[PDB]
Homo-oligomer: A and B are copies of this chain.
Amino acid sequence: MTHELISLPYAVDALAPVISKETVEFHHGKHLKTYVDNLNKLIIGTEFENADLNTIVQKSEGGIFNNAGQTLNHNLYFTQFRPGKGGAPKGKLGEAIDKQFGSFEKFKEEFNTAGTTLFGSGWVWLASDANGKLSIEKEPNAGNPVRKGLNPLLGFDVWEHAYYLTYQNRRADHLKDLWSIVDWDIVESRY
C-alpha cells in the first residue's frame, strides 16, 4: 500500500486562531508529509508492506510504528475539526459522555488535565472499547488507541509543533481553545 497525505476538507486558514494558517501549513504540509513519506519507505521489505494502516499501528514496532502511529493520529486530528462549531456532543455519544464522566463539562476538564499533564510529546485520546465504554488515554509520542484494540474518537496533539507558533508554552490555553473547533457530528460518527 502506498499511503497518501490526506487532503484537508477546509482551507488552510479555516481553523484560525486556534490552529493558525501557518501552523496548518507546517503541521499538515511538512510534519505529516514527512511521517507519510517515512512510513512508505520503511515498510517495503517487511510484513507490513501490503497491510492496511490500522493493522500497521496494531502490530508494528520501532520506526515503522512511529510513522504509522503519527500518520493515523494526524489523519484523525485534521478530519475532526471544522470552523464555527464546537458546542456539545449529542445522540448516543453525548449520552455516553454524560453517563461515564458525569457531564460534558467534567469530561472536558478531565481531558484538558490529561493533556496538560502529559510530559513531553504525545496525544490525549477519547476512545471507546468493544462494549462502548469510554476512556481517556494518554499516549506518549506516536501512540494511538488502535494499538490497544480501542476505537479512537477524539485526539488532541500535545507535541509542541501543534501549538507553539501561536501559544508558545501555554499548552493548557491551546487545549481549552480546541473545543471551539471540534465537529461533534464527525466525532459522534466514529462512535
Binding site for B on A (CB under 8 A): 26, 30-31, 34, 63, 66, 119-122, 140-142, 159-161, 164-165, 168-169
Contact = CB atoms under 8 A, between A and B. Distances in A.
Nearest to A161: B160
Q: How many copies does the complex hold?
A: 2
Contacts of A165: 164-165, 168
Contacts of A34: 169
A120 B35 CA distance: 13
Contacts of A168: 26, 30, 161, 165
Contact of A160 (B63, B119, B159): B159
B120 A169 contact: no
Contacts of A63: 119
A93 to B, nearest CB: 30
Given A66-B119, A120-B140, A120-B141, A160 B169 contact: no
A160 B165 CA distance: 11
A10 to B, nearest CB: 22
Nearest to A141: B120
Nearest to A164: B164
14 contacts: A26-B168, A30-B168, A63-B119, A66-B119, A119-B141, A120-B122, A120-B141, A120-B142, A121-B121, A160-B161, A160-B164, A161-B164, A161-B169, A164-B164
Nearest to A63: B119
Interface centre among A121, A122, A161, A165 (most CB of B within 10 A): A121
Contacts of A31: 169
Contact of A169 (B26, B66, B119, B122): B26
